[PDB]
Symmetry: C3
Subunit: 239 residues, 3 copies
């Protein structure tokens, strides 16, 4: 069902959903490439316990790209320049116990734009949920190793100062990759990334890269100074 | 083989095919979005028993859309502005006895256009066939229940007077959607509906909506008064 | 890794690859429709006797079209006008026994265009390899039968003289197709052959057609005199 419509304000109010949903539809008149600083934060609140945080100030571009990788792609309409569907659980929907609800907030919005939220319910309830985490490589340092065991998808910020990537697999084999090779490998699973309103397609953003991780237990990044690199990693687990 | 080429008239001659075909190819110089009133009628004239009716004046837009849902789409050559492949059977082709035939006819054409029919033969024979049925919702009706048990695909005429549509599943849950929610959810299965000659792609017609029915046993329509809603449903069965 | 950057010459030198690779990346500033006479030759050199010939002076267009059939398609970029990923083995990379290495070369290049090779490494090794063969039908004859058993993919040249293409399957059934029917049927599996730089798509090349051979043991060509018809077939086998 329709959740909220935000316009004319920089910060969206705390939105509460008491109905068990399975996915969220984000629709806005801002094109996906034009999104700059919008952030989202979704979690599950319990009456007599600690909250369960699924996302925490995740960038809208990273959230959309992580949630729409595969056969699907973000679409458009005559009135909305961006429509995306992002699922919060595998197969079924989220099971809500007593005194349990869902809370969604939006931050860093543009004054003269529009945003909408829609909730998508399912005929089933499941215990598996999606979590989003962030890993940063600082600008001052040169190389860094980050452990991505248990994750199945990552989003890299694309920059020209990054030179080398290293993948360590489960069987201990280490493979060397370049940004060009990584982009070409990524575009062999989901060729088209988005469809524009006028009819043209875009096969990938110029500042984000979607890395599918299978049997990967580590990522080493070799770069130079002057820029900060960010990874948005997605995982599935039972709460 | 080439069945017919029709131009200059408003009604097709009663065409007959004796060879066992499994699929039809409809080609025309009229774009997919420019089809208005053309209709098709297909039926197999059996010799031992009753005849088989596969399509009874089905509108050409819905006939094309109900067959090209999934990995495929309707294409366009440099000469023909619309080419579509529509299957009449499952896997193999239609099994025909010594003197049986398949009779096809077209109605409500345009005198300054051209329509071309092709038939595809297949190595195997089968008895399973696809049936296209038509359902209607009256102008004075408020809410209506339709049993879609056994079907797997429907096409509805998109109208502004339709408020809600509710899916009833096999296990007994009822989920109420919206037109926008249904469009978004259906666009994630076949993100591309057609490809134009100039290279632009179209992700969906603005006046038809395709609904895939998986484990769905009921459809409830809630709308206002003053319009007739049209559904074209496809089913697979053995005759 | 980086293999070669050929520019300013009409013939690339012999290139040796010592470590195991499983896929090549061909990149250039000429689009898929701008490749005319470029040829590629890949083989495996054994130190003490005999070589394994995978591809010998195969046209670059046919090599690219025989590898990117299916979900994938040839990519573009803001700098590279064509990128194509062609796998040289199934699943893993090519296993190398004692004292052998891969060797690649190019012929018939345009002296004012840029070509680039990249290699892809994998964490697995395999024995299966992809072999490419070429078949021809002369210009002074009318009909001819060719035997394609064991090949899973073929590429034929498209000419106006081709009238009928008869298939012969493993169960003995014979089906006669037309060029239009073949073109329509081949686009039901891969509807998009390439994605252009500006955001448009192309569903196929004008002079080349791709035929997937499943349960097919023979082909017959009925054509008029005037043009030589060329086939490039791909097979998978162990070495």
């Amino acid at each position: 069902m329709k959740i909220a419509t935000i316009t004319g304000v920089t910060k969206s109010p705390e939105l509460q959903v008491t109905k068990a949903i399975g996915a969220l539809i984000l629709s806005s008149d801002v094109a996906l490439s034009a999104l700059t600083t919008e952030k989202i934060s979704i979690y599950i609140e319990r009456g007599n316990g600690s909250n369960v945080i699924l996302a925490n100030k995740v960038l809208l571009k990273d959230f959309i790209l992580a949630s729409t990788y595969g056969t699907e792609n973000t679409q458009s309409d005559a009135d909305n320049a961006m429509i995306a569907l992002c699922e919060l659980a595998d197969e079924g929907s989220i099971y809500l116990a007593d005194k349990e609800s869902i809370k969604i907030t939006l931050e860093d919005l543009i004054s003269d734009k529009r945003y909408d939220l829609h909730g998508i319910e399912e005929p089933q309830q499941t215990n598996n949920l999606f979590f989003f985490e962030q890993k940063s490589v600082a600008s001052e340092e040169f190389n860094k190793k980050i452990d991505v065991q248990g994750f199945d998808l990552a989003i890299m910020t694309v920059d020209d100062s990054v030179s080398d990537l290293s993948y360590q697999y489960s069987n201990g084999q280490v493979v060397k990759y370049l940004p060009f090779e990584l982009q070409t490998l990524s575009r062999d699973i989901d060729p088209i990334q988005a469809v524009l309103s006028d009819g043209k397609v875009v096969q990938g953003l110029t500042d984000r890269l979607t890395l599918p991780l299978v049997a990967v237990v580590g990522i080493e990044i070799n770069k130079s100074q002057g820029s900060i690199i960010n990874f948005v990693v997605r995982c599935l687990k039972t709460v």
